[PDB]
Amino acid sequence: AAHIGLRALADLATPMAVRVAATLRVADHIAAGHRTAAEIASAAGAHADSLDRLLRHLVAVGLFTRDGQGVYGLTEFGEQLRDDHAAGKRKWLDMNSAVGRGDLGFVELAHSIRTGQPAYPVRYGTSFWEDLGSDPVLSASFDTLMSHHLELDYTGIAAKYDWAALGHVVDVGGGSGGLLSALLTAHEDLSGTVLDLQGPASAAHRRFLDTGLSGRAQVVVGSFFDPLPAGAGGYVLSAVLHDWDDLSAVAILRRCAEAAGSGGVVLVIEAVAGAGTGMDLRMLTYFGGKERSLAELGELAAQAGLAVRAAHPISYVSIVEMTAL
């Protein structure tokens, strides 16, 4: 990151200003015709002088434009803040979304680096999953988010592997079914089931029902720490292991080992170290999880009686295939 000055490199004013902008939808208000601080503030329900001061800072940062009359506009860059923008980044920074909220837990990083425990609880007084499990709205935003992460990192994962051969795929921690839906849409004789908590499971169900996939896709509300529906061709763990510490990760893999038996395949699909150090710190502060390497996944697999037998990179992530030892 060049040579800014340690103080500027540790600046919180700017990223927080962006996050607040995202949350106030300032960009969308600007496009809808509100351009002065007074108008924008009224539209967003913010303090005029304070909002104006925030905008002046973001103008400097390079997201907004401001003319002598006090009329603000967006820049090529500031366009990415619009809620309708193609990259859909605004929702990730919105302090109301699960991740826009979770990231503020970074303000407690010290506790994580000191104890190895997650920081999120220090800030919100409860674990991440517990927090979602009791706030359906919050949980829904998280589902939408993980759904978006799929379009972003798993484009065409359907062809990058022989899914059809599996016959039946169990998506352990499958969220709202975005991935399973994708697999089944590309392989018409394939069937599967999403195993997750109440929130995502019900969402997965709504999706399959509305999409005309209920004939091949089913959901099951359960904890992947307990026995899984057994006998399927393959068990998928998409963005799930890095959310857990080593001990819980093997517990999970262990359950997939058993469900898969001697004829099943366990497929860990996530950002393998090699997926930056930023995401790794997020896993640490959120759940005390971590981004792992193929070697590190190999170790976990060994403890669960599995072995890596393949690892296919597919854009941002990789599909590491494990089978009974």
* Cα gap 116→287, rounded to integer Å: 10
Q: Which of 43, 65, 92, 220 binds its own copies (CB under 8 A)?
A: 92
CB burial of residue 13 (10 Å; 0-12, 13-18, 19+):
exposed
Q: Between residues 21 and 146, which has the closer beta carbon with respect to ligand SAM?
A: 146
**Binding residues for ligand 5NA, total number by CB under 6 A:** 7
Contacts of 239 (CB under 8 A, 6+ apart): 146, 149, 173, 269, 270, 271
* 111, 187, 205, 242: the active-site residue: 242
Q: Which of 94, 171, 243, 321 binds ligand 5NA (CB under 6 A)?
A: 243
Q: How far does CA 1 lie from the centroid of its chain?
A: 25
* Cα gap 270→324, rounded to integer Å: 20
Residue 255 is a binding residue for its own copies (CB under 8 A)? no
Residue 99 is a binding residue for ligand 5NA (CB under 6 A)? yes
Residue 277 is a binding residue for its own copies (CB under 8 A)? yes
Q: Which of 73, 225, 293, 309 binds ligand SAM (CB under 6 A)?
A: 225
* Cα gap 249→255, rounded to integer Å: 10
| Adjacent-strand bridge partners of 265 | 234, 323
Q: Between residues 239 and 297, which has the closer beta carbon with respect to ligand 5NA?
A: 239
Sign of the Cα torsion 225, 203, 297, 192 reads: positive
Sign of the Cα torsion 272, 278, 284, 287 reads: negative
Q: Between residues 20 and 145, which has the closer beta carbon with respect to ligand 5NA?
A: 145
Residue 259 is a binding residue for ligand 5NA (CB under 6 A)? no
Amino acid at 267: L
Query: Which residues between 149 and 178 bind ligand 5NA (CB under 6 A)?
Result: 149
Residue 80 is a binding residue for its own copies (CB under 8 A)? yes
225 binds, among ligand 5NA, ligand SAM, its own copies, none (CB under 5 to 8 A by kind): ligand SAM
Q: Which of 12, 86, 125, 212 binds its own copies (CB under 8 A)?
A: 12
Residue 278 is a binding residue for its own copies (CB under 8 A)? yes
Our answer to whether residue 85 is catalytic in this structure is no
Tokens for 124?
Answer: 């919100």
CB burial of residue 116 (10 Å; 0-12, 13-18, 19+):
exposed
Binding site for its own copies (CB under 8 A): 1-3, 5-20, 22-24, 45-47, 49-51, 53-54, 56-57, 60-63, 76-77, 80-81, 87, 89-90, 92-93, 95, 103-104, 106-107, 109-110, 112-116, 276-278, 280-282, 284-285, 290
Which residues are tagged catalytic?
A: 242
